[PDB]
Structure 1
Amino acid sequence: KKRWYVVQAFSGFEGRVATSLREHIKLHNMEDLFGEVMVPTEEKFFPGYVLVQMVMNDASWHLVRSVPRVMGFIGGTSDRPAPISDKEVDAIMNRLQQVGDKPRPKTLFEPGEMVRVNDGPFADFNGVVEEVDYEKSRLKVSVSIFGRATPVELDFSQVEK
C-alpha cells in the first residue's frame, strides 16, 4: 500500500522537478516504491508543491531528497515525515474543479459598475457597465473616452471585477 506525501520544490521549476523525479525512479529502479507524481492544474494550485504516491523507507526518502531542486518533505518531523489524509480524498474525487465549474455559466465577476479592462483593446483602463450580455458573453462597459462614457463590447475574461 502506497500513501501520499508532499514535496517542496523551487517554485517555478516544478514540471522539471516532476520529470527529474520520474527519471531518478527509473534510474535507481525502485519501481515498486513509487506510484504517481501529481502537479494539479486549473485552467495552478498548489503553488510549488509536488504530490508523490510513495512508501516510506529511508532509501526512498534519500532518493526523493537527492532529486535536484527539491528542498524536502513537509510534515510533523524530518525523521518520519507525514502523509496527508484519506477522508478528504472521497469529497475531492467527486469534485476536482471548484475554481472553474459550470455552476455559474454567466457572471464571472460582480457586474454593478466597477470593473477594469486589460485583456482587450483598451488595456489598463476601467469603466461603468450598464447592461451586459452574459448569455452571449458580452459586456457594455461605458469607458471614459474623449470626455464621454462610450460603451465597448468586452470579454468577461478580458475585463476584471
Structure 2
Amino acid sequence: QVQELEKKWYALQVEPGKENEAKENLLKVLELEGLKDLVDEVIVPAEEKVVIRAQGKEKYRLSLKGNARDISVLGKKGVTTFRIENGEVKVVESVEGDTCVNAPPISKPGQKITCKENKTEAKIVLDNKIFPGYILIKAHMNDKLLMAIEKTPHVFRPVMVGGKPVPLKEEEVQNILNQIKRGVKPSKVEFEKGDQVRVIEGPFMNFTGTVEEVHPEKRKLTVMISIFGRMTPVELDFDQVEKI
C-alpha cells in the first residue's frame, strides 16, 4: 500500500533577467547532486510569446494565447505570413522554395520555425514581466535541497519566513499560472487620454474630469479635475472612475 509524501510549492528569488538560466542551472544541479526525485516541477511564471524576425531583426513580439492572427513580414526575397491561433504558430505562406510552410505548428517555449529562403522565423519565448525575479518549484524541501538551491548560479534562495522555506498554496499557484498562460489579455486599454470621467469612489467621488495620462501598467489614471477652478492632477484607480 504505497502512500507518497506530498511535495509542496515554493517560490525561489533569482537574479532578475536571469529566470530562464536560473531554471536551467537548477535542473543541472538536481542532476549532479542526485536530487531529481525530490522535485516534480520547476516553473517560470511568465507569459509565452512569439517573436517574429526577418533577417535577424525582431519585427513582432506577440502573445501566444489570443484570437487567431496572421502576420506578414518582408524578408530577403518576399513575404512570409505566420499564423497564431489556438495557442500555436505555423507558417501559412512563404516564398517559393521555403519548406517551412510544411513545418508542424509550434506551441512551446524554445520551439521555432525557420524559413531558410526568405530568412524569416518565429520563435516562442518567455517574457518574464509579471513576476520577474522568480521561478516556482514543487518539491520535497530538506536541508540538502535548500543548500543545493542556494548554491545554484543565479538563484538566491526560496522566499522564507522564520528561517524556513514558505510553502505556497496549490490553488493560488495553479490559478496564477492559469491566468498568466491561459487568461484573456484585453484587446485594448479601457481608458484613453482625453476621455471624460466621473469619480465613483474616494474623497473625489462625484467630481468629473479628463484623463490626462493613462497607466495600463498599474491601471492608474491621471485625471485633471477642476477644484476651485484649478485643473488639478488627481491619481485614481481604473476602478475608481467610469466613462461619461
- TM-score band (shorter)? 0.5 to 0.7
Counterpart residue number, 1:113: 194
Q: Which structure dedicates a bigger proportion of its chain to strand?
A: 2
Alignment of 1:23-62 (within 5 A): 23-42=28-47, 43=63, 44-62=129-147
Question: TM-score, normalized by length of structure 1?
Answer: 0.58
Offset at 1:93? 7.1
Q: Which blocks of at least 5 consecutive residues in structure 1 are unaligned? A: 115-161
Offset at 1:113? 3.2
Cα distance between partner residues in 1 of 2:30 and 2:161: 25
Identity of aligned residues (%): 29
Range with greater deviation from structure 2 (92-101 or 58-67)? 92-101
Counterpart residue number, 2:162: 77
Counterpart residue number, 2:113: none
Q: Does 1:88 align with 2:169?
A: no
Offset at 1:68? 1.4
Cα distance between partner residues in 2 of 1:94 and 1:50: 11
Q: Deviations over 1:37-80 (max 9, x none)?
A: 111223422111111111111111111111112221212122x2
Cα distance between partner residues in 2 of 1:69 and 1:111: 40
Alignment of 1:120-139 (within 5 A): none
Cα distance between partner residues in 2 of 1:94 and 1:54: 17
Matched residue type, 2:143: D
Cα distance between partner residues in 2 of 1:27 and 1:21: 10
Counterpart residue number, 1:8: 13
Counterpart residue number, 1:67: 152
Alignment of 1:132-151 (within 5 A): none
Give the aligned CA root-mean-square deviation in angstroms. Answer: 2.7
Q: Deviations over 1:78-125 (max 9, x none)?
A: 2x22101134346x17952499616x54x42423637xxxxxxxxxxx
The answer to whether the 8 A contact 2:42-2:136 is kept is yes
Matched residue type, 1:67: T
How many correspondences in the alignment? 110
Counterpart residue number, 2:202: none
Q: Does 1:101 align with 2:181?
A: no
Q: Cα–Cα, structure 1 residues 17 and 88, in superposed 2: closer, same or farther, change >3 Å?
A: closer
Question: TM-score, normalized by length of structure 2?
Answer: 0.40
Cα distance between partner residues in 1 of 2:19 and 2:182: 21
Q: Which has the higher contact order (CA 8 A, sep 6+)?
A: 2
The answer to whether the 8 A contact 2:10-2:167 is kept is yes
